[model samples]
Target: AARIAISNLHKQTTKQFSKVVEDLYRYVNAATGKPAPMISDDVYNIVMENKDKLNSAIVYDRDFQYSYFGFKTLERSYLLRINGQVAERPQHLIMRVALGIHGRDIEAALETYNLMSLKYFTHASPTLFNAGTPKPQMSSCFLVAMKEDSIEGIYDTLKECALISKTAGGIGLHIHNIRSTGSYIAGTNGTSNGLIPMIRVFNNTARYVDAGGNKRPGAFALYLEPWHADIFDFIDIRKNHGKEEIRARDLFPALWIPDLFMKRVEENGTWTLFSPTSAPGLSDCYGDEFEALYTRYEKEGRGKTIKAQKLWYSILEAQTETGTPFVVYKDACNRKSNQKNLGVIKSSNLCCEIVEYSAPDETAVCNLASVALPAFIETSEDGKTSTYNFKKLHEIAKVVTRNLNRVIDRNYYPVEEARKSNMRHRPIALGVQGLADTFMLLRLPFDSEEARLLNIQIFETIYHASMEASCELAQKDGPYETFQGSPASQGILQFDMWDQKPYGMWDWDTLRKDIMKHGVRNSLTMAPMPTASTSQILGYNECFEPVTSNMYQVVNPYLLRDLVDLGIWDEGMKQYLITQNGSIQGLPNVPQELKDLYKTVWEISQKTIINMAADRSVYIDQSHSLNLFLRAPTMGKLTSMHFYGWKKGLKTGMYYLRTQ
Candidate 1:
């Protein structure tokens, strides 16, 4: 088994380790056809040392352990390639990540490689994909608040976005401070074009700044608080058939929702939309304090009144039409955030997975890594007794935490603000990729009581492991610079904040005491981010989400020409999904329990999903990247769900709304 693994590894990577290094050195930009230096000279020289041992150290045959689809995904995207060909094998990619994180520390590098190659845990896709590359931009998400509301500020922010996108970073930008439509712009000396026009400029920018210059399209998720005067228009940017000039179809829209909006809608009360210039500080506060200030402004008539249900209906319509206007609860995000000391967290990063605080001077950055939950499921020699290895998971979590810390120092920050914020907060997001896989391996139905307990326990384990690891790091490197005044510093964890108890997986009492004694190395530890790309590479469902469809067909790029040549057009699995309305439950030949376990969000009760999110929210200090799925969402249903999540004190009420 070992030799086969090693041989497979050899077949995947170049023969000489130096050759891999040299290819990366000589890499040319696909678009510009010019030498674009990605890696620094120092990083190159460091990899050259002990190149022979590095080449011999990797066990190549382990490559066979990956599923066929997983291996193909690696070949297509994860593996470092030369001229559209894979250069570094799976083991080599692991080694590159090790070297990238712990340069010149051969022992640490190899240890990281062995654990990663053995599938104990895995770093985020960007880390695996670009770790040892020329321009290794390995961090997953970058959060930036609009520098200012002016033309120069918007353009400057756009420039920062382009630079970050060129290095393969996803972005979350907040424009709540910008004056609403018809508001005056002193410089332009005219009524400001609404957010639609300004966002169109951003929509184009997102398309232009392709990830790593043409590897993928530039992705920018725009965040707007629902209280903005242009709130109605902001939600329409992603709609399919809209007014030609008003629609910015390429960009993803998300809601940075404040709690008061939900409460007002629930009570059948009024809602007010306001311009930042006139109704100042709406975006600067959270929780009840924000509600009070908002009501005060309303009383003073500094806001425009609209029926609360009117805007509520608009949100539902947008979701049904566009499957978006991703939702993030403002109060929950700030109230539960470890960065509460910094300021109100204005927005989450792209994909709604990262919730961090970003200001004009401080742009948040999160280095991501995910634990494969299925890897923790252990089978005994008897083949009957099995257990989830919580202890081992805790150990791996510590290692991942340390590695991400190292990444902070080794990372290439596109802007000075990002570096400043990352170093001070030291926030890292430790998420999971394969909860659904774990359920299948354990033979539990997705909605079963046992499955629900496992869900909570799994996240509890990750949260405990992350906290323990951060505490350990505190012992060595000391706590983060701004660790004081945070919840973790006061022995308050995510569960504690939500009034939930730990399941005895770890000694919470001792951990809490230890935290008070030494402080934690990071402000925020665990965030269940959307693992779209990484999950695809691993052949697993996206983070903590049930499968939407089973036996679905992907267009075979290779077979497209062949089908045309043979004149054999296929309907593919579109008919299957359409016949079932994207539900896998009725698929023939699939196991009944598997069908039960794989029900899409539309089939599951929205209340159950919200409860599950709230259950896990107790353990998640920041929040989750939650997407709500509705086949035919209505104003009433969306209102009830949003209010339910808010009442449950979920920090991230909703991330995205997916509708069919």
Candidate 2:
């Protein structure tokens, strides 16, 4: 059935992608001059010539490895379609993405194909969705800064976002520069209605535009600094109980909080909210400079004053009610950014993993991929001893880095500013999945000392590999346009910024020296994004998070397999697992080691989660999509957690606060 399904999807299975690309390219819309022409001419011609080599490289048996939902996910959304019918198989999708990135380089294409087919790594959803199709807009995350605080600028930014949404991109946009409520509008000679009205406009766009052909809703994560006068109402827009007129529930609200705001909250001090029209320039600086400007304005009585704790409680309440207004520390993001030399980074991307510089004319974009961390867990022939193959993981990370770098050049940008910034800075994000699965396979507790140590080593290896690969690319094409003023250019790496030392797992000194000499081809690397959809397809735990539960039509497969092998996985154990709500805490007949290895996220300490994030921070130059899970959340617990993350120098304090 599988083989016939592949053959029946398209009559010309032998020609594969070139046929599909050609068919799509010939059709013109008459409005745009040309249909966004599938694979570029170079890619089409290359596929035509390498038909034999590409066909032989595919491994059909690999298709069966995917979980049922994984295969179904491909069928429903990922596989290429022709006139509402599926036109490609899973293996075909992988091959097309490889060919799409490498173009005429046959050797590089096949290497990518083999690695991806064997499940070592996979590209982001957009890459998989559009790689070999018409208008290959293969970028996943776009960070857009509001063009200006004017009507013309606002509409233009909205139009840019619409075009990006039409191509299935997720966005992060900041509105810090916009004036607050009741502020005077000089041209109209009227009072401004402020963020709520403007945000509603964006909310409608997100609803109407959708994320490409209505496969998913458009995603726009709106970010504002806490010092904005409209901060109270801004966080309220996403609440479940809000009025429809006041709500923009379709949008994700995030706070770009400065360290100063947190300090006030900690000290029980006063916080003054300001409109940019009067306060002017608060959003454009960070650290001591931002503090000086803010205090000077406060002393001059530039805005409204309130208890800092009041706003903090509102944020906490909003999160407990709505799970967002994602928290990211402005000072930590700016002080620790390689692009800090670029400018003050206004906001993070939709998932809070990408932190890059975006200006009025330069909208930042990043290509993404996540290597399956469990793929690197090697077991002995007798299937008893298991060890993480850091060497293999290092090799795969380099491959992932180079492939993503190629994507920056090969991608179809939805707007001019995105193309301009991409070419100049050239950033790529490499993330991971199945981390919790790796821990279980090795029989280690999720919060064990050894697990923590291994986690750091994994990120460190990937970081080193990416730097080494990027340096090699630089030697060929020269450094990225804005590499000179970056911390990396000055021989300071992410670990250097945190004053943390590496474990000598890899030769970092040599790579650092090489980076100084040749410079790096990319400005930023290593942003671990939330892999909710992609992780489902790959049969892994989401990103680096702990397993949320162990029972379902969703069984923890490792645990299930262990019980089956021991002849203990009968209907009684299954019911008990269900009764325990997927927890095996006190289940009878289960070994203590197996029980220890299978503690869910709720059972594990959140301190360990934050600590692991900090340990990985030394190597993660960008940020991590870390979600904090609390069984019962309170203001005190939330306050303590945010302070802990902020003090640890984490760029993103929390992605989302998950409450039980």
Candidate 3:
């Protein structure tokens, strides 16, 4: 299983990445006549100096373990290549990233290479692509606010977004301050065309601004407060049935929802929609201040009022139709943020996992990588049951924490604000790749009590390690610049904000004392991002999500191997699978054990997803992505699910509600 592709590359490329480095250094850009270097001079020099040690570090056997899909994903987007052919293999790529991060520290670089090539955790795609390269824009996620709500501000912000996209940076642009439709403009005395038309310009930019020269489209998540009058317009842009002129489906949409709005939905009360120009300060505040101000505005009747369900139903309809407008809880994001000392956070990153403060002066940025949770699962007792090693999980998480913190200092920035904010706060996201795979490996059903227990423990270990490792860093570098008055410095954790209970594994008491004494290097840690790309590289189920279905063309290597070994996968089985609606459940030919193991997400209760998200919420300083699945989604059921997560105080109520 190990080192298959690695060995193939060794055969094709003579087993030396040093040769590839030399080629890249001598290379020139197609446009520019001057030499265009991929590997940094210092890194290339170091690699040349330690050719034997570095080349020997490349593990050919490790590539064989990667499934065809994993190998292809790496080849398509990650591996360093020339003339449209892959030049460096996966092991070479890992070694390069390590060298990129540790140009002056070869010992640390080799140590990181071994850990990563073995697949304990993988860096985000940006790191994989640019590390060791001349331009090392390694940070995965960036958050930016609308430069300001004027023409100059808008164009400046657009330029920022465009440059960010070019550097392979995924952005979250907080845009609630933009005036709504019909709001008078001071300069021209003209009414605004509103966010819809404005967002279309952004949509075009997202499409045209290719990521790493068309490796992928530019990625941006546009965030707007739900209380804005243009909120409906913002929501409709992603809906397929919307007017062609209004829709801007190329970009991702998300809501920064206030708790008071959820309260309105809960009580079936009237909700007021305000234009930022009229209801000034709403975008600047949250918590009791927001509620008080909002109520006062309603009392004065300065905003338009509607039944809260009207908007809630609109959101559900959009999700049921287009699977979008990610729901990120604003109050909870602000309330739980460890960067509260910086300011009230306005939005999340391209993936909803990051919740950080972004201002005109400072664009909050986070370096992110997910922990491979399935790697920790241990099989025994004739492979009937498995146990996860929390200690190993903890140790690996510490490594991830330490690596991500190093990334903050070593990273190359595309924008000045991103660099400024990153240096000050030193935030990083340590996400998870496959809780579902871990559950399946342990033979525990997705909704089972045992799976639930394991889920909590996994996050607990990661969170603890992050704190301990970061505190260790702080002991050397000092706590993040703005940590003095933030929640962690005050000894408040994420779960404490939600008033949720933690399942004990690590000693919280002593860890708390350690954190207080040394503080922590990173302001935020443990954001469980949707592992869309990295999971493809590592060959695992998506982060913290259950199997969506088993009847489809099985992309999961583990499942397919099991079926082939059991003599259940063949032409006849393929026909049967096509007939099944994403499952092998109730099939007479398959073993009952296989059926139980392969139960798709459609069969699991939605509430269990919410429960598991809450279970892990105790440890996650940053929010997580939790999408609900239903075989048949009705307004009634969807409404119920939203309220449940909302009342449970889940920071991320939902990402995408999968109906099909």
Candidate 4:
């Protein structure tokens, strides 16, 4: 019966190796009569030479490891297709990604393919989706600034955006330079149409240019410095119930907030807003320089004044209504950046993962990849021997880091600006997908001391490995161009900035000493991103977040109803969890330890969450994409949480507020 079941599943998936590649090759452009070759001829030849061996290496039974929803997500978005039908199975997808990373290096490709196929660590979704494809634009996010405040520049920028969106890139564009409503237009001799009218054009562009031709929505996160004259209207762009003409609901709005604005709000001081044209280089400076420029403008009486509290109130109101206008510390982003010498960073990407410098001429791009944390967990005959494989994880991290770096060189840049920035900075985000899963596998409760310690240790290990690898690369390729004056050059690590001691898991002292002597290859190394789509593909909860609910209604990507048909929801696990208030705790049949380990974010104390984030913040240079979960969040609770995080000296106090 077991053999029959295995055979049946294998048939459901793919077994023939050649069939998978053929499917991918055909899928590149089904509409066009011409065939577009994604993989190199050398790589294709290597796969063909060892087709049988490669096919056998895949453990097809592991495909069943995915949950119903996860499997469906893979089928829908990840798996290589031919003429809109899924042709490459899950195993085939893994092999394609492995080959994509390693190319003609068969041994490395096979090793990666086996590990990934066996449900070990996987790369980010973009990498998995586009790695071996014809136009391999495998990056997740791109940050670009408006070219200029003119018709030719806007349309040119728009074209660049549309092209980038076509290859599956999420964008972050800053438009602080654009003139505000009622501003003078020199040529037209008329009042400027303002940000709303201009952004409406961008909103339509975002809708029209679907990434990978409707594989995903084209995401364009619009960022503006809060000191822009139209800051009030900018904050209201995403409200669901707003007037249609005024609201660009599709475009994600974010505030490129300076420290001075927050200080003004705290002290009840007068705040000033100025047009970028008038203000000139205000957006191009940071720290004391930015302060000096603003103060000078105020002294000259060239700025429009408003009550600081009024703007703060507007921000709060926007949060309450739209749950948006993501707040990022401009000074912090620039001050801590390895690319600080490049210029002041303007904004972060769509999900607030990457903080990088973007300019009119340079579009900052980041290629992202993730390690499956839970896959490192090992179970031995003596259950007590179950532990995470740190050594293997370190090795894999280096490999992923190398892969991402290589991708920057080989990737199809959607625009010249993107190409220009990526080649120079060469930044990549190495994030994790299943942090909660890792804790659960180790029988560590999300709120427990053990879990918290493990959380810090895991990130520390990743950071250490990434640093070590980067240093080694520096030894060979020389340090990044802007490395001399950066923190790494001075041997100051991320944790050092927070005034925290390393847990002594890795030899930080040795690494620091080496870095001080030789410097590092990459500008930025680690950034913990929101692994939303990738987590769904792996059947794991999103990055470092507790499960929202044990048993919840999940609309499968395939739009199927299996629970009702199978009668599983009527008994066993589903009914019990519903009665337990969407929790698995205190259920008659469920293990107490399992319940403890798997508690949702709602069940875990918010204090513990904050503390955990703070603990890891010391190691995270770029900051975390933190999401606060509350069944019913009050203003008091939100305020308290923000103050706590702020007092804790977190670079990013909060990323998102999800309320039930």
Candidate 5:
């Protein structure tokens, strides 16, 4: 549909919310000169009825809180537009989204509006772009299987991808079952030119269909198991300076590695690469069953064989050069997934964080939102003592959980398969931004014991709060469609699957019992996305990551409190800090203790980064987009790092390497 569906109306447009609603209700399609209402009748009526109180509640001054650059980002593509002019201010956008989620539940809507206007928590980009619009496609991530293997199936899936991309949905497509090259095509009586050519077509398609939200262009992450005959071609697909016809330079390449491959690489054993045709059902099984089948194929000599390290080295070399081909464990994902009863989880979302099951019939989708960590900063009387408000953080987490679940039902799916999946699974992702900011605000070093402790406890609280919120929903709506045999139905939380003890910051025993009884409204929750765009809008550091640099001149005044206490706040030091690229280390004037307190990511070790990922993954049911930073990564450095992550039992081995 080419009809415009917009949510924002600010600059005091039409003077008030009631007037703005009247304008949207009377919108006309320029193409046909016919009336086309851009706001729903029910939504229009509700806003009109509550216009007096709602208009009084908005705080217009919040627009000044955004820095010059942060405000620039909004003016570019995020804020809703009409006739090439900006609509509302930030407060208007927040209020619109809150009402969209809560509908006639006016009290709950105001609660959401307050937290969002205060910058406590925020919805995903699509929600920001489309909420309160007539046709709202608010979910952020979508995962779909190849509809089929033939030309009809391939193009059908491509059409689905295009339609989805046109609606602002990022897609993860798995082609594990597609046959290898040169086997036989009875329909055409010809040998296949292999996955390279097919992926090239998809690359062109991705380029042609512009993303609905121009926050990014059409993004497609293609995933394949290591056993696929196109395994070599898949790795080289995104590589620059490759064979022109064989390369898909526009697509993001990802791998679904089985544990058996890592096990072979660890033991220095032979790793066989087989086409799906020859090694049938290999992609369908996991754990011991996969190991047995893979071994049988190897014994029968059904595919090409080489030392596992050879392939492992090739993987490491690619990351060193290109910082891509994101890795996720096939066996680990399935074995630990609550969606196991729904069948084998085929692939992850574009960022390698969402682990959900997808088939030809069910296209897995997730509605996402992020909690603003720095918003919970609190101070006592006289402002002498400061601490985080964990109680408030938990309360907001519950609120976000409810909003995302409601979005699942209200969302407009671009494809029927996406609708089917959302109805059945009802999955949502509640992540965070400004974790590093939280640590800095709390005056704790990133790698310090206290920071690590806070990390676990924060995630522990979110996981607890998310489940409790969903359980509350289940009390009224009953459990999700497929909740009977799922892991949570049996009282197995993510930590239980990890076999780790709780941080004792919250009561889990009662919640565990409560979940098994009432069930939960969502099948899965708590995916800490990379927070690339939202963090910029909310002015927080990215999700669960350390500060990359303080070069932007946006460092909080609170961060300087420690330096002021230590008498290191002179202006000469400021010039020196910028000259050192924001690193306080190696400065002749800085103390060793202060330097430790403010090391940017490059100054810290990847060991701590990966270990923290492993430690926190215990509480995150889905996964996090764990990027590893290396100023200048080498083949040797990359090799050791990859193996370390695999050994640490991380489902997502790495996202972007972020090499200099």
Candidate 6:
């Protein structure tokens, strides 16, 4: 029986692979009489040349490792197909991405394939979807500032966004320089309608573009400085009760908030509103300079004034209703940026992790890859306990950093501006998934002291390994263009800017000297993104988040298996979990330690989450998608959270508020 079971599964997979090649020529495009293979020519060549070796390396039984939903996610969006017939299995997809990056280097490609197949790490969704394709566009995010305030420039920027969306890139666009309501049009001799009408146009474009031919909707997040005269109306656009003519519900709205505004709110002082046309160059500078310009404009009577807390309340009201207007600290972003030498950063990316400099002539872009953190946990000889392998994690991080660099050279840019920016700076995001899983496997509670210390060590290790690898690459290829005046060139790193020291897991002093000597291949390295989709594909919890709940039948397979092994999982136990609203606490049969380990996000204090983010922020050059949860949110609770994060010197105050 055992032999038959194993043989049947292998035979099915083998038959599927054979049928993919067998049916290749029969499915021709109806309009054109030619054969169409889903695999690209270069990819086909690599597979054909190494057929025997490639087949031998693939461990077919590994496919069983994926959860049912994860396998379904791969099939739905990731697998290659031709004329409605899926051609690539999960292993085939991994091989395709590996070869796409390394090209003819067989050894490197095989190593990447093995690591990915075993779930050590995964490239971002675009990389998985487009790699090795005829026209590969693999960037996951783009940052575009308004080209200019003119109509011609506006449409030009619009076209750029459309093209980027066509290739599935999420965008963050700031209109800090746009003229406001009733502002004059120089050539047209008419009063401008300002942001509302123009934003509606962008809304429809986002709806129409539909990323990757309906794979997902085109995602565009528009950012505005709080001082814009249209701030009151802008905050209302996404509210469900707003007028359709006045609303642009499809777009995500964000604020590039200055420190002065938050201070004014804290003091209950007055705040001024001005158009960029009236008070020019407000967005071009930051920190003390921004405060000086802003107060000077207020004194000159070039703007109107209102209670700062009133606008604060407006933002809170909108967030309470719509869960938007992503809050990013403008001063924090500029002050601690390694790219500060580039210029003032205008906005963050769509998910709010990236804070890169952007100009009309250059559209900043980022390619992302995330490591699977749980893969580093090792079971002991007696299977009594599991231990995290930081040494192996550091080793894998170096490999992932190198792969992202290769992707920078290999990626296809949709617009000239993006290509210009990417080639000049070569920024890439190295993120992680399954931190919660790592903790669970090691049997640590999410908010425990051990968990917090482990979190810091993990980020520190990744940052160190990535810097080492980037430094080595710089030795080979010279430093990235525009590296002379950057922070790394001066031996200043991310932790240095944060005024914090490393945990001493690696040699920071030696690495700093090496960096000063050779510089680094990439301008900025660590960005922890919200791995919403990629985490699903890898069957891991979201990036560095506490498990939200145990509500889903078996949201955490590890927990499910543990309960089954303990002989405590049954129909009655399922009903009991439901009755407790997914809380494992107070279960008479469950072990006390297991109950603590399974506590959901709602039961954990928000202070721990914010503090943890602050602790890890020192190691991350870019920001993180740190979403906060509150079971019973209020005006006071919300206000305190933002202020706490700001005081902690976090660049990203909040990604989105998860209020229940």
Each candidate's TM vs. the true structure? 0.90, 0.95, 0.95, 0.90, 0.94, 0.95
Q: Choose 4 or 5, whichever is better by TM-score.
A: 5
Lowest summed lDDT across 10 adjacent residues in model 2 is found at 5-14
Checking candidate 4 for backbone clashes, the offending pairs are: none
Tens digit of lDDT per residue, candidate 3, span 95-185? 8888888777778888888888888888887888887888788887888988787999999999988888888878888998998898998
Candidate 6 local lDDT, residue 108 = 88
lDDT, model 6, position 643: 94
C-alpha displacement of 75 in model 6, angstroms?
A: 1.0
Clashing pairs in 5: 10-88
- Give each prediction's root-mean-square deviation over alpha carbons: 5.6, 2.7, 2.4, 4.4, 3.8, 2.7
Regions of candidate 6 where Cα sits further than 4 Å from its true position: 1-27, 31-37, 561-572, 586-591
Model 6 lDDT, full chain set: 0.86
In candidate 2, the residue pairs with backbone N, CA or C atoms under 3 Å apart (3 or more residues apart, or in different chains) clash, namely: none
Local accuracy by lDDT, each model: 0.78, 0.86, 0.81, 0.76, 0.83, 0.86
lDDT of 2 at 374: 92
Model 1, residue 235: displacement in angstroms?
Answer: 0.9
Candidate 4 runs further than 4 Å off = 1-9, 12-14, 22-32, 36-42, 49-56, 379-381, 482-484, 516-518, 553-576, 584-599
lDDT of candidate 6 over 1-660, digit per residue (tens): 334433443454433333443344245776898765555666667766776676677776666667656776876667766646455677867877887888778898889989999989999989998887767788888999899999889999999999999888799999998899999887979998899899999999999888767767788888999999999988887887746689888898888999999999999999999989999989999999988988899999999899999999999988888888888988999899889889899999899999898999889999899999988888868787777889999999999888889988888899999889999998878999999988887889999999999999999999999999999999999999889999888988998988777789899999999989988999888999999989988888888998888866564676788899999888888887779878888888899878888989998988899999999999998999988888878999899989999899998888888778
Clashes of each: 14, 0, 13, 0, 1, 0
Write one digit per residue (lDDT tens) for candidate 4, span 1-660: 234433444566556877667544544465766766656565577678877877777776677777756777777777765656566777777877777677766777777877776666677777787777656777888888888888888898888888888887788888887878888888888888788899999889888877765666687888888888888888888887747788887888887777888778778889998887778888888889999999999888887999998888777777766687777777777776667767678788788778887888888888777788888887756875687788888888887777777777678777888888877767778888777767766667788888887888888888888888888888988777768887678877777766678888899889988898888877787778888887777787788888776555642211113335544444666565556666656666544655566677888878888898788866665766877777676766666676676656666666776766
Q: Which one wins by lDDT: 2 or 3?
A: 2
Report model 1's TM-score to 2 decimal places. 0.90
